[PDB]
Amino acid sequence: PHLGEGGALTGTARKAEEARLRRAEIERQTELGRLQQQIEQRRRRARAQIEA
Amino acid sequence: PHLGEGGALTGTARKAEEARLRRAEIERQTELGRLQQQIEQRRRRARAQIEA
Numbered sequence: 615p616h617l618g619e620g621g622a623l624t625g626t627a628r629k630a631e632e633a634r635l636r637r638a639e640i641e642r643q644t645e646l647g648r649l650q651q652q653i654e655q656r657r658r659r660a661r662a663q664i665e666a
Numbered sequence: 667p668h669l670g671e672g673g674a675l676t677g678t679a680r681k682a683e684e685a686r687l688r689r690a691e692i693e694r695q696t697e698l699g700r701l702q703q704q705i706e707q708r709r710r711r712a713r714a715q716i717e718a
Contacts, residue, residue: 664716 616628623631668680675683 616623618635620631668675672683
């Protein structure tokens with residue numbers, strides 16, 4: 615059975631929709647990872663400054 | 667007995683020399699105190715910055 619919104623999709627369209635969902639959710643994960651790395655950088659400067 | 671350099675001093679000159687010695691040594695003490703207060707100030711900024 616077709617799972618997810620826009621269930622009318624069938625055939626090649628179903629695979630295309632699956633690929634699009636994978637791409638978008640992957641890039642959302644990349645967004646969150648980049649924010650985490652940003653906070654990483656800020657904390658590094660903070661405690662290095664404390665060391666000085 | 668006269669104690670200290672320039673023992674030839676006698677009479678009013680002895681009291682004057684004593685007063686001059688007192689003044690100079692007092693001002694040396696003031697010098698050292700001011701340096702200690704300076705280091706005081708530097709340490710205050712240092713650890714306040716650490717707190718931030």
